Symmetry: C2
């Protein structure tokens, strides 16, 4: 096994995904039209409702609605070619290096089969964790499989969604330390903030993790 | 309404897609091992079989369900995303398209998913060759009403390597349509397709031979 495994969410934890979405939305409107791009987002927001970012299903439903508009499907070319390495948070690579010396670092992410893997790979994060990457539709429903890939006496989960940390905490209990970094917009959403138990630790920045070796309780 | 509209498939009509699949498979046998890839391809085959066209994307989703912790085979996508599609465009295809474009709208009518096929058509340079006149559907032969609304013509030409498609479209449009079959790719060489289906109005050895089409 392992004394400790450090599990990381990717979006708004390791890398600034809000900024990616802001850049996408601005691009889409410029290339495809205000009306057309507004509509795709209305679909992408029901889907973000039901699942995490479902770029893909939103695309598939947009096509049914407007099968003549092939062009808007090229929005993928923005994501595919986006500079994700520029969006990695200051200190994020240092935290992964620092904690990697004490136990395996693993990226545990919700996502589709095209964009999310490509993001993690092209951001350079994939290789920073030596390919220790699991990507699910709902990671908190696959916690059994996470354990057998990366068995450990204790786990840490760093994630900006309190809902996820709360679900994982309920599943694993004292075997888990939950860390909520106050990054992105789920950090300041009042529903999230008010409807789930608090994380064990809150850090202002992902780079604050280098200051807490004592909390891992390692020999 | 135009006198004539020229409709073209992409895969194995304007672009050599077998060469691409061949390179893709060698990349996957070489990077994600033999069985992982074998499995992916058994799945791909099945949905190519019932969808009617090559769906990499759906094949990849089905694979994830089956092999959820093999996260890295999913990075097969990146080979396709960065492939040099322009090098695969057949000799004389850009000529056929520009000459015929002098006589009426040139249009790409392809089956596709929503990620890989459009990217391919764009990065190949063919999207700009037909000036954006690109339609990509799940079952293009079931969408012929829309195609007529978008490109009203008195006569259509359809270039496609699938005698199944040409036949379905001729059964719909009859004398309004000239079907063209280019002997390109593996369907050119298929006892199964050649004998299951009727012949096209025209057969040509190569796509570039359609510069000779001035009626
Ligand atoms: Cl732009
Ligand atoms: Cl005309």
């Amino acid at each position: 096994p392992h004394d400790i495994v450090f599990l990381f969410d990717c979006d708004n934890t390791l890398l600034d995904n809000d900024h990616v979405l802001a850049d996408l939305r601005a691009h889409m409107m410029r290339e495809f039209g205000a009306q057309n791009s507004a509509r795709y987002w209305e679909i992408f927001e029901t889907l973000r409702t039901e699942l995490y970012a479902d770029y893909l299903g939103a695309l598939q439903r947009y096509r049914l609605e407007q099968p003549r508009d092939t062009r808007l499907l090229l929005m993928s070319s923005f994501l595919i070619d986006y500079p994700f390495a520029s969006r990695v948070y200051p200190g994020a690579l240092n935290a992964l290096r620092h904690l990697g010396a004490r136990g395996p670092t693993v990226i545990l992410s919700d996502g589709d089969v095209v964009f999310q893997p490509r993001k993690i790979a092209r951001s350079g994060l994939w290789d920073e964790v030596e390919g220790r990457v699991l990507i699910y539709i709902h990671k908190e429903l696959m916690l059994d499989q996470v354990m057998e890939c990366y068995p450990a006496r204790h786990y840490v989960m760093v994630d900006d969604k309190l809902r996820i940390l709360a679900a994982m905490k309920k599943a694993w209990g004292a075997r888990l330390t939950t860390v909520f970094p106050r990054q992105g917009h789920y950090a300041f959403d009042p529903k999230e903030i008010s409807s789930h138990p608090p994380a064990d630790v809150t850090v202002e920045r992902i780079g604050d993790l280098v200051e807490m070796d004592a909390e891992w309780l390692l020999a």
